[PDB]
C-alpha cells in the first residue's frame, strides 16, 4: 500500500500482485535485512512475516537469475557456417434426477391603450422594419476587412509575406455456611459443656433432607480439621469433640 | 412564512403543497390566509394579511391598502430584482402554484370556496395600477388557469373513459349487477359533466376577467408571457383551444411594437406546428399571415428572424402552400446574411426545399444513393444553378457555410461531381458549361476548405472554438479521404483545365490542406511528380501574377522539409527555376542591348520570365542562382534610358528585394562573415539608390513600390535590429537621409492624404466595378500604415509625423484609425515628444489657417472650431494614463504659450499678439484636468505678457481670457 516495506507486506501476505520489475531491482536484500535487524517495537509474528517476504524475494531472484542463465545458454550456442454415438450414457438412466412437489410610488394614469393606437398598429407597421445585412460579394472585401484594423495592420507587413520565417524577421522589429455451622457448634457446646456432640440429637426434630445436610456439615467440618469425630462400631451415633481449629 | 419557506430553499415543493392541503382540510380560513399572504409577499408588499381583515372586508380595499402599505425601500419588485436567489424564487413560486392547484383536482377543487376569493383578488390586482401587483397577479392567476386547463384535460379524458364504459355496458344487457354498474357509470358521467361545467365557469371567468384586459396592457412582458403560454396550451390542449376564438388574440398581437412580444408570438406559432401535423385551421392562419411571417423574417431582432425562418421551415414541413417564389428568393438572399445563425437556418430551409431529385425526404434505398454513380448529380446541378443565379456573391463561401451542417453527407461525395466535371457521365446530359465549370470549381474550393478548417469566415468568426474528439477524428479521416481522392483527380483535372487561369488558381488552394506523410504511406509520389510536371506546363503556359502567386504558395506548402518528399519536390523546383534562369539570361542579354528593336516579343519574354522568377523567389530561397547582376543591370538601364515598360521594372525591383531579404535570411543563421557582409551592404546601398530614383520617377505605381521597398529596407536596418542578441550586424546599419525623408513626406502627402477628386493622384472609382474607390483607399491606408510603422520604431523623424497627426479631422473616415493608433503608439514610445509633436500638429494647422485667412484668423469659422475639437479629443487622450503624466502636459502648455507669443504685431498694436487664437486651442488642454501645475503654467504664461496686456479685456484678446 505505502512504505519501503510495503512490497515485503505484499510478498508475505498477498504474493499475487508482485511482478518481475519489483523482483529484479527495487531493493537490495542485504540492505533491507540490516534495516529490519535493529528496529524497535517489532512483534514476533510480524518479524516472521518479514522473514517470509525476504526469503520469498531472495528465492525469486535465484529463480529469475537461473532463467537469465537459461536464455544466456540459448544465445551462446548459436553460430554461422556458410559451409455415431460413441461416448454417452445408457439412455438417460444415469441422468434422470426428477422434479418433486410628494409620493414617489408608481401611479399609472392610463393602463390600457385606446382603439386608435390599435388601429394605427394594424394599419401601419413599417416603422419597426429593417431589410438585411448583406454579406460582401467579393473575396477582396474579406482580405480588406480581416486586415481592416490598426491592431492588425500595424503588426503585418504592407506586402504579404508568404514565408513565416520572413514574418519572424518582420516581428523582430516589433516591440459462608461453614462459619455458620462452626458458630452453631460453638453455642451447641456451651449449652452442655460435656465435649461430646451427638449427631442424632441435632436431627431429633427435623426431616430427612436437613438431617443429611447436617451429616455432610459434620463431614466438611471434619475435612477442615476443626473437629474430631469418633465412631467405632459399624452402626452408632457419631461423637464430635472440639479439634485444634475449633475457634473456641 | 410560506413566502420565506418557498423562497429560502424549499427541500420538496410537493411537501409544502401537501402541508397546505392538510392545513386546508384542517381549516379553510387559515390556509386561505397563508396562501394570500404568500401571494402578497410574492408581490413585493411587506404587509401581512390578518384573519379578520381577510375574512370580512373586501378585496378591492385590500388592494388599495396594500398599495398604501407597500412599504418599499426601492422600486424593484421580486420579478425583476438581479438574478439567482430571486430567479429560483420565481421558479419555486410558479411551481408552487402549479403543483398546489393540480394536486387538488380530484376532491378539493369542487368545494367552490377558494377560487372565488383567489380569482377576485388576482383579477383586481391585475387591474391594479401598480406594475408589481399587475405582473405578480397575472403570473399567479395565469399558472392557476393553466393548471385549470390541465384539470379540464383530465376531466375530458375521464369523460371519454366513462362514455366508453357506458357504451360497453350498453352492448351487454345481461346481468343485474351489470345494470347497477351502468347506473354507477351514468352517475360518474354526470358528476364529470358538472365538474367540467364548473371548470368551464372558472375558465371563462378568469379568461374574460384577466386575459382580455392584459393582452391590451401597456407592459410588453405581460403580453409576451401570455402569448408564449397560450401557444404552449394550444400545443398541448388542441381539443378546445384550436379555433379562431383564441387565434384572434394571436393575430392582433402579431403586430406588436416590441421585439420580445413578437418573439413569443413566433414561438407560439411554432408550438402550433411542433410537433404534430396536420390541421386545417393552422393552414388557414398560415395563409392569412404569410405576409406577416415574411415581415418577421426581416425583423430588426436576429432572434425574431431566426424564429420566423424556423416557422417557415415548419410550414414547409406541413403546408408547402403559403410561401411564394419571391419569398423563397428573399430567404435565398438571407442565406447571405452576415449573422451566421440566420444564414444557417436559411440554408437548412433551402436544403429541405430544393433537394428532391431522388430523396423524397423519406426512408433510404432510393434517397441517399441508388447504388450507382448517378442519382446525386441533379442535387449538384441545382447547386451549380443556384450559385449561377446568386449574383449577390462571386464566391459561394457564405452559401456553403450556411449549407455545411445541413448537407454534411452530400458535400463529401466529391467523386460524383468529379465525374460530372471531367469524364462525361452516362446520364446523357449536355456539355458541362465553362461558367458552370468555374461555378462548380468555386463550390469545391469552398466545400473542401471548410472540410479542412472548420472555422467560419470573417464576420461569422467567433474565436471561442473548442474541438471535441468526434470533431477532430472527422477532420482527420476527412483529410485522409480528400488526400487519397484528390491526388488521383487533380492530374486529369489539370489536363482538362490547364489553360484556365482562374480555375488553376482556385484548384491550387486545396494542397495547403494535404497531409504529406500520407504520400509516404500511400506511395503516390509518382502522381505528385505528374502533377508537378502538369503545373510546370501551366506555369510555362501562363503569365498571370495571381496564378504564379498560387503556384509559388503551393510549392512552399509542398516544400515542407519535415516530410520525406522534400528532396523529390526540390528536384522539380530546381529544374524549373534553372530553366527560368537560362531563359532569363538568354532574353536579358539581348534585351539590354538596343539592337532591333527591342520589339514587343522580347519585352514579353523578359517580363514573363521575370514575373515567374520573382513569384517563385518570394516563397523560396533561390539566391544560389545570383541573378541580381541581371536585375541590377536592368534597373540601371531603366534609370539611364527610362523608355521601357513599367511591369518589367516592378518585377526587377521586387526580385532584387527578394534576393536581398533571402540573403538576409542566411546571415542570422549563427554564421556571419564579413566580406560578404560588406558586399551585401554595398548591394543594398545600390538598391537604395535605385529605389530613390524610382521614387523620383514620374510613374506613380513605381513611386508606391519604391516607397514600400524603401520601407522594407529601413525596417531591415532599423534600431530594433539590435534587439535579437546581435553583434556583427552593426556595420550593416544604415541611417536615413534627411533629403530622402523629405521626399518620403512629400510623396505621402501628395499620394495618401487625399479625400477629393481634385488631386487626380487617386483613381476614379465612381462606377461600382472592380476598379472602385475602395481599392485605392485601402492601398493608401496600407502605404500610410507602412510609413507610420517606420515612424513608431525610432527610424524616421516623427516631426514629419506631426503633419500626419494634424490630419485627424480632415481624414477621420479614411485614416483616423491610423492617425489615432500612431498617436497612441508614439505616446507609448515617448509621451513628452508625442505631446510636443501633437502641439506642433496644431501649430501647423494654425499656420495653414494663418496663410489661408490672415491675422484676423476668422476665430468663429469652422476651421477654428475643428481645431478646438481636435484639441478637446487630444486633451482627453492625455491625463493620468502613462508615465510623466503632467510633465508632457506642462511641456505641451509651454510650447503652446511659446507659439502664441512667437510673433509680434507690427501695427495695431504692439501688445496684441499674433497667433493669439492658439490660446483657445491650449485652453482645452488646460480645462480642469490638472490643478497644482496650473499655477506653474500660468507663471510661464505671464512671462510673455505685460500688465497692459493684463488689463485689456476685449474680443481680440478673448483667446487669452479663455486660456487664463
Curated annotation (Swiss-Prot), chain A:
Q: What is the effect of changing residue 240 to T?
A: In MGS; causes delayed food transit along the gut, when tested in zebrafish; may affect RUNX1 and APOB expression
Q: Which InterPro entries match?
A: NXP1_M-like, Rad21/Rec8-like, Rad21/Rec8_C_eu, Rad21_Rec8_N, ScpA-like_C, WH_DNA-bd_sf
**Positions bearing Phosphoserine:** 37
Positions of modified residues (Phosphothreonine): 175, 241
UniProt cross-link Glycyl lysine isopeptide (Lys-Gly) (interchain with G-Cter in SUMO2), position:
39
* Summary of the tissues where the protein is detected: Expressed in the gut (at protein level).
Where is the stretch described as Interaction with NIPBL?
84-101
- Coiled-coil-forming residues are none
The cross-references to PANTHER family, in alphabetical order and at most eight, read:
DOUBLE-STRAND-BREAK REPAIR PROTEIN RAD21 HOMOLOG, SCC1 / RAD21 FAMILY MEMBER
**Family of the protein in this entry:** Belongs to the rad21 family.
> What does UniProt say about this protein's domains?
The C-terminal part associates with the ATPase head of SMC1A, while the N-terminal part binds to the ATPase head of SMC3.
Protein name in the entry: Double-strand-break repair protein rad21 homolog
Species per Swiss-Prot/TrEMBL record: Homo sapiens
Ranked from the top, the taxonomy reads: Eukaryota, Metazoa, Chordata, Craniata, Vertebrata
UniProtKB/Swiss-Prot annotation, chain B:
The record lists the membrane-crossing segments as: none
Where's the SCD domain?
Answer: 211-296
Grouped into one coarse class, the protein's main location is: nucleus
Superkingdom in the source lineage: Eukaryota
Any single GO CC term annotated in Swiss-Prot or TrEMBL for this entry: mitotic cohesin complex
Q: Name one GO biological process term.
A: establishment of mitotic sister chromatid cohesion
Q: What does the record say mutating residue 292 to C does?
A: Found in a patient with cohesinopathy
Record keywords, A-Z: Cell cycle, Cell division, Centromere, Chromosome, Chromosome partition, Disease variant, Intellectual disability, Isopeptide bond, Mitosis, Nucleus, Phosphoprotein, Ubl conjugation
Q: How is it modified after translation?
A: Phosphorylated by PLK1. The large dissociation of cohesin from chromosome arms during prophase is partly due to its phosphorylation.
Residue positions where Phosphoserine is found in the record: 671
Cellular compartment(s): Nucleus; Chromosome; Chromosome, Centromere
Record family assignment: Belongs to the SCC3 family.
Name the associated disease, please.
Intellectual developmental disorder, autosomal dominant 47: A disorder characterized by significantly below average general intellectual functioning associated with impairments in adaptive behavior and manifested during the developmental period. MRD47 patients manifest developmental delay and mild to moderate intellectual disability, usually with delayed speech.
What role does this protein play?
A: Component of cohesin complex, a complex required for the cohesion of sister chromatids after DNA replication. The cohesin complex apparently forms a large proteinaceous ring within which sister chromatids can be trapped. At anaphase, the complex is cleaved and dissociates from chromatin, allowing sister chromatids to segregate. The cohesin complex may also play a role in spindle pole assembly during mitosis.
Kindly state the subunit structure of this protein: Cohesin complexes are composed of a heterodimer between a SMC1 protein (SMC1A or SMC1B) and SMC3, which are attached via their hinge domain, and RAD21 which link them at their heads, and one STAG protein (STAG1, STAG2 or STAG3). In cohesin complexes, STAG1 is mutually exclusive with STAG2 and STAG3. Interacts directly with RAD21 in cohesin complex. The cohesin complex interacts with the cohesin loading complex subunits NIPBL/Scc2 (via HEAT repeats) and MAU2/Scc4. NIPBL directly contacts all members of the complex, RAD21, SMC1A/B, SMC3 and STAG1.
Q: What is this protein called?
A: Cohesin subunit SA-1
Q: Which organism is it from?
A: Homo sapiens (Human)
Q: Which residues of the full protein are shown?
A: 86 to 1049 of 1258
